[PDB]
Amino acid sequence: IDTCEKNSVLEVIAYSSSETPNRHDMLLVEPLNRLLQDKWDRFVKRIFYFNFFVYCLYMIIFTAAAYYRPLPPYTVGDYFRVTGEILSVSGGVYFFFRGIQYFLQRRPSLKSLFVDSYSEILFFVQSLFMLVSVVLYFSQRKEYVASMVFSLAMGWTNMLYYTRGFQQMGIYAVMIEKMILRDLCRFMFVYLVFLFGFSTAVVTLIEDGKYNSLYSTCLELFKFTIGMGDLEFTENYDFKAVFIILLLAYVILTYILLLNMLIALMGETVNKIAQESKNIWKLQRAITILDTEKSF
Amino acid sequence: IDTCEKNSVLEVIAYSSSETPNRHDMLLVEPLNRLLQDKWDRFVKRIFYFNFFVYCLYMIIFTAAAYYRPVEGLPPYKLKNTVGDYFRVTGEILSVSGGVYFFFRGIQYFLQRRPSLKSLFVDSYSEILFFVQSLFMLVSVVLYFSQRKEYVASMVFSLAMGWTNMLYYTRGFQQMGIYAVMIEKMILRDLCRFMFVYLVFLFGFSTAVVTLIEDGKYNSLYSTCLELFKFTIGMGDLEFTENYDFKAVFIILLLAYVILTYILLLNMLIALMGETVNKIAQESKNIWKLQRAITILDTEKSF
Amino acid sequence: LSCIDTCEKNSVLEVIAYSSSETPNRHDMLLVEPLNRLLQDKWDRFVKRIFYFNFFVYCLYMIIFTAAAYYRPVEGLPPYKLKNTVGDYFRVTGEILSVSGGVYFFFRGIQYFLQRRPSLKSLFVDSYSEILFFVQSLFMLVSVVLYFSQRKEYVASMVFSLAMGWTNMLYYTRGFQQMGIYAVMIEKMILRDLCRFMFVYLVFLFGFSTAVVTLIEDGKYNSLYSTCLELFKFTIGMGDLEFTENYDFKAVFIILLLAYVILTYILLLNMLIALMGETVNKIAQESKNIWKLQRAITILDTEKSF
Amino acid sequence: LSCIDTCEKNSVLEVIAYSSSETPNRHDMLLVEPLNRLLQDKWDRFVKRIFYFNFFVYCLYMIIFTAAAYYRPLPPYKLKNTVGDYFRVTGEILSVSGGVYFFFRGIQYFLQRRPSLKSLFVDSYSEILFFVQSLFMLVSVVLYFSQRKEYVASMVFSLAMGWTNMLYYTRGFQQMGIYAVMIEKMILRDLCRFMFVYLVFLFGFSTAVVTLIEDGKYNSLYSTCLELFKFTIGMGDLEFTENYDFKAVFIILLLAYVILTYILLLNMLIALMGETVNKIAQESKNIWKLQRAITILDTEKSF
Numbered sequence A: 001i002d003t004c005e006k007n008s009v010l011e012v013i014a015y016s017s018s019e020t021p022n023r024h025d026m027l028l029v030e031p032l033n034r035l036l037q038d039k040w041d042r043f044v045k046r047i048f049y050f051n052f053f054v055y056c057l058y059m060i061i062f063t064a065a066a067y068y069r070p071l072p073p074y075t076v077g078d079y080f081r082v083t084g085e086i087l088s089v090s091g092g093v094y095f096f097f098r099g100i101q102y103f104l105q106r107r108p109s110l111k112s113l114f115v116d117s118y119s120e121i122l123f124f125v126q127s128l129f130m131l132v133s134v135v136l137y138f139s140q141r142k143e144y145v146a147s148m149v150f151s152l153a154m155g156w157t158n159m160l161y162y163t164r165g166f167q168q169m170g171i172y173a174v175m176i177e178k179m180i181l182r183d184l185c186r187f188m189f190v191y192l193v194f195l196f197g198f199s200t201a202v203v204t205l206i207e208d209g210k211y212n213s214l215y216s217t218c219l220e221l222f223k224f225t226i227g228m229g230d231l232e233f234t235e236n237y238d239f240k241a242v243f244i245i246l247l248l249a250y251v252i253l254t255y256i257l258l259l260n261m262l263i264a265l266m267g268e269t270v271n272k273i274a275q276e277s278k279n280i281w282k283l284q285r286a287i288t289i290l291d292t293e294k295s296f
Numbered sequence B: 001i002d003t004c005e006k007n008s009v010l011e012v013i014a015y016s017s018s019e020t021p022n023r024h025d026m027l028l029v030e031p032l033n034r035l036l037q038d039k040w041d042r043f044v045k046r047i048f049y050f051n052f053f054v055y056c057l058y059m060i061i062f063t064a065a066a067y068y069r070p071v072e073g074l075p076p077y078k079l080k081n082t083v084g085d086y087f088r089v090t091g092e093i094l095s096v097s098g099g100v101y102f103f104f105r106g107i108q109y110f111l112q113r114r115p116s117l118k119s120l121f122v123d124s125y126s127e128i129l130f131f132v133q134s135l136f137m138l139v140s141v142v143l144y145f146s147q148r149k150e151y152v153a154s155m156v157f158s159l160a161m162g163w164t165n166m167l168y169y170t171r172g173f174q175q176m177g178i179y180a181v182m183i184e185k186m187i188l189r190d191l192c193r194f195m196f197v198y199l200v201f202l203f204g205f206s207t208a209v210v211t212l213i214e215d216g217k218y219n220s221l222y223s224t225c226l227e228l229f230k231f232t233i234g235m236g237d238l239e240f241t242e243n244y245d246f247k248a249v250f251i252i253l254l255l256a257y258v259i260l261t262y263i264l265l266l267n268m269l270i271a272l273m274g275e276t277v278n279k280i281a282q283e284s285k286n287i288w289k290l291q292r293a294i295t296i297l298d299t300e301k302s303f
Numbered sequence C: 001l002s003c004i005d006t007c008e009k010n011s012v013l014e015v016i017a018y019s020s021s022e023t024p025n026r027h028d029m030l031l032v033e034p035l036n037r038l039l040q041d042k043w044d045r046f047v048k049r050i051f052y053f054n055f056f057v058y059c060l061y062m063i064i065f066t067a068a069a070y071y072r073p074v075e076g077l078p079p080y081k082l083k084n085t086v087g088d089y090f091r092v093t094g095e096i097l098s099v100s101g102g103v104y105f106f107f108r109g110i111q112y113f114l115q116r117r118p119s120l121k122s123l124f125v126d127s128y129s130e131i132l133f134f135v136q137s138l139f140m141l142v143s144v145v146l147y148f149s150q151r152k153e154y155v156a157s158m159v160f161s162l163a164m165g166w167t168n169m170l171y172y173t174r175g176f177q178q179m180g181i182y183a184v185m186i187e188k189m190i191l192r193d194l195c196r197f198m199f200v201y202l203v204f205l206f207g208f209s210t211a212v213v214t215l216i217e218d219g220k221y222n223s224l225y226s227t228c229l230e231l232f233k234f235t236i237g238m239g240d241l242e243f244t245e246n247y248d249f250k251a252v253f254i255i256l257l258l259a260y261v262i263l264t265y266i267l268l269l270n271m272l273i274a275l276m277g278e279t280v281n282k283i284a285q286e287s288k289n290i291w292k293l294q295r296a297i298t299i300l301d302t303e304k305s306f
Numbered sequence D: 001l002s003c004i005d006t007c008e009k010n011s012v013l014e015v016i017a018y019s020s021s022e023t024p025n026r027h028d029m030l031l032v033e034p035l036n037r038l039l040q041d042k043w044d045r046f047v048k049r050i051f052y053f054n055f056f057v058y059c060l061y062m063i064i065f066t067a068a069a070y071y072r073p074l075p076p077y078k079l080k081n082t083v084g085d086y087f088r089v090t091g092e093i094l095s096v097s098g099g100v101y102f103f104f105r106g107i108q109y110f111l112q113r114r115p116s117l118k119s120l121f122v123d124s125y126s127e128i129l130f131f132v133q134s135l136f137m138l139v140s141v142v143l144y145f146s147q148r149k150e151y152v153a154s155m156v157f158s159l160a161m162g163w164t165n166m167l168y169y170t171r172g173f174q175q176m177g178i179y180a181v182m183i184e185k186m187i188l189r190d191l192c193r194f195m196f197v198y199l200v201f202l203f204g205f206s207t208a209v210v211t212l213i214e215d216g217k218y219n220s221l222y223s224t225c226l227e228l229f230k231f232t233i234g235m236g237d238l239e240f241t242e243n244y245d246f247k248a249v250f251i252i253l254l255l256a257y258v259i260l261t262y263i264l265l266l267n268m269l270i271a272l273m274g275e276t277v278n279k280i281a282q283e284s285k286n287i288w289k290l291q292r293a294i295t296i297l298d299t300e301k302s303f
């Protein structure tokens, strides 16, 4: 069941592809749940806490190094800074190698890489950004800072991966995943269509000014969504009536309707997916247990 | 059942009048739903994808009116003998042809259906909106030839209305189709009710505030109404004017307005839309199924 | 129908429509078949148009009053002369009509109070519209009193009356099931959720504003009113977080502002939204029944008006 | 009621009310018929009146304290010969007296109950909050006499804490009591989870941005953190600086932060609050009843 050395039920269920109809519900059987919970507390609950603390420390060291950066390449302060930079690069390459090892070991069907285990892809992409930032730094360029800030943001965001192992916060993270995947996606598609259409209309209306550029008008229109719109950002054009009509149409369509609809849909989805989000967290904790077990 | 060429069950159900009690729920019968799904997957899916692809492409031939629109004034304009002006003119011709085609499609629908003149404005909003877009394009053309400067506004309206109309092509996918159906229900019911009440409240408080002040740039009704509306979008000032008297009265009026609209009616709208979401799931799925059925039957009749 | 419609002593429909709020389940009384069918019949026969006629005349009155108010002269030291012009004639006759309407509303309110004879304990949840209209009428009358007393406070009173008149159009939402239900939802929410949230939020606002103004030393924002307004301005999504800099202990100022923001904007407003959602999910049936009872009260009052 | 209300050694009321949180069903106990009839009898009999008097005197004390602190003049300060200065001094003396009184009441509670060092941070939030308010007041007094300006900061902290703590007296009013209990539950669960996630995201993106920014006003971590936080209150700027080498990266980072936090996390917080409110009605009523029982027992035991 758990230690077969030929084929284990735990390995089959946990490492199953998304195709399996009930890869979550079948971990709730009495013996499996009892064994998983007992193992976690026994010798995987404090192995995970140590990993989480080490990652936190690594990220602190990475932030300190990057935040204090001086045509690269470029006292006690400098020795500490270079040591931190080297340690951060050494962590990035470690994550890259772990991701490649996971890619080879699991060898996905070239379909579940895009639908399953988003954590592995995110971590590998963070490592890839860090390595690109290193090569640019050693290749006489300044885009090494853009790559590094991208990697830093992604790494800080990735700390949610460790929210698993704490029940309530694990459920919260699973809910975040579901919401982003379904509701934010639908809303963003519709809202981007609306925003682009109205921004193009307004740009066509505008005759001459600083806001002829499609980017400028799109930014100004998006400014409404964040409660910072202007509604008078420009007055260099004819037919003010048409401009105000278009602006009011956009406001009513996007701010007064789509965002409130997003709130309502989020409420409904949260009301719907409590038990599924509990089962998904349980399975995410089972995969963590088995990965920790196999890492030796 | 499906095609007797005289009066088939699917044809009558799909073209049902609004007065029919449960026009939406008829398709749920197993043979009918299984027959629509099979026919779609068999030959209508690719046709619909092609139509959406060519439609969005056709609209995009004119969404670059920014780069197109000259600024010389008093059209018509001249031809520059450059590749750029060749692209501009061919795009304009392609945008006018599209408008004429959509106008005639609407006319062909209107005549063939021969509506009883009541369900026209109650159901089938998509084709009315497409016809309005065609009308706005034709008006742009006629104004353009007539040496007038209102063609820019007329094409801008058409452009915006077409970009929003892509929401029609949103159908054909269960998730986004049902999302569009929910948007339709919400904008018809909750937005209309809230808009009526909020517009009454805003007009009242705007007239009160305008009467309060004495003179300045905000003396007009329109300007003060705009300032009061700016509270709703999260940009309210609370001190937009100084040339007045009775600061107590002005402040208390602004507070009453804010508390009554921003902190009450918007949250009421959120709650009502939430309960509507909770209530119109299966209804919104059935309506999407009926929309797909109408599209399939129209494609069949398109030969 | 004998002993149901009208007896000159007591009829069940009149009793139900005018029943005191203290009755346990006065709302469900209308649910029985004969009452529902008969009220629908009377409305569709006569009161449907009569109510629309009471919503057409009132709208005309309010438009006339607003037109008179907006075009008012600004010269000071009232009253003012009646110059020879069509505009002056029209505005003065509009003023006369508006004052007459105010007097009419004043008299109707007095008559209702004298006939119903309320206990002065049920004039908040009951006869809400009556109190609103009477207060509007009172504001108009005091406006006139100031006007002919040679005081400029008539402008303030008249603008208050105008605001109440325009916002009282919701009374006429009855006669349309969806609009009437929405209006009664507004009234219930105002009665419960707005009043609870406002009390808590006001306590928080006053506390933090007093703390901040105590911290400040001198300047424009040294007063309690200006600081209270600045703190309130966060709630409408236009906070500053840096509105003042003439003080000491920037850390304390930042801590207080962040604490206030987290406690109010992030917690209490989203809590109000959640409670409103729950209530709305809970108040459909009673909101329908209350609308039906309000409908019946309108029917009975129109019938008794003869 | 023999050995239920008064026993001098142990009774059902004093055992249930003062039961540790380790007790499984501590809340549901008071719903038993005779207990519910006895608590409501004692309350109506006298505890309502004593509680109302205590609330009124506390409100008077807080008004005095606010007035004294508002008109504050290297302390200490002398006594100017004027009525205003005498009233200020007597008011601040009264405020200090109230502070020491609350301090000693908190000490008495600690000595009496003798909690197990774990219920302190999970039970009795009100008493610890009152004690912290008193501690701030005493620290303010000692600093004031020690010739420092830090007394102003201490006293403003105490004043704000007291004003927000005034909610303690909302109990004894059913609706406001349930409201306060629900506020307590929301702060413990939803605000905590959201704050954890939001702080993680905010620090990550703020660090990224401040790393991108070359130099200027916002080259410090605190300033950039403040600017990013401003987006949460509907006051983000999106153009607050231009001192960077890559505009595309800056705009992408800001858009990602906005989408992740403002659009997503805030709306999700609203939804989670709605779910919780739907979930915790009966549990919020039971907790209010238990709070009302504790208050009744305390008032009885105070004499």
Ligand SMILES: CCCCCCCCCCCCCC(=O)OC[C@@H](O)COP(=O)(O)O
Pocket (backbone or CB within 6 Å): B252, B253, B256, B260, C128, C129, C130, C132, C160, C163, C164, C167, C168, C169, C170, C171, C172, C190
């Ligand atoms: C000194 C007064 C300060 C307040 C500013 C004056 C104007 C405030 C607007 C009036 C407040 C009530 C608005 C409201 O929300 O109720 C709407 C009414 O239709 C109630 O409906 P109905 O008459 O009972 O049918």
Ligand code: NA
Pocket (backbone or CB within 6 Å): A226, A227, A228, B234, B235, C236, C237, C238, D233, D234, D235
């Ligand atoms: Na704002």
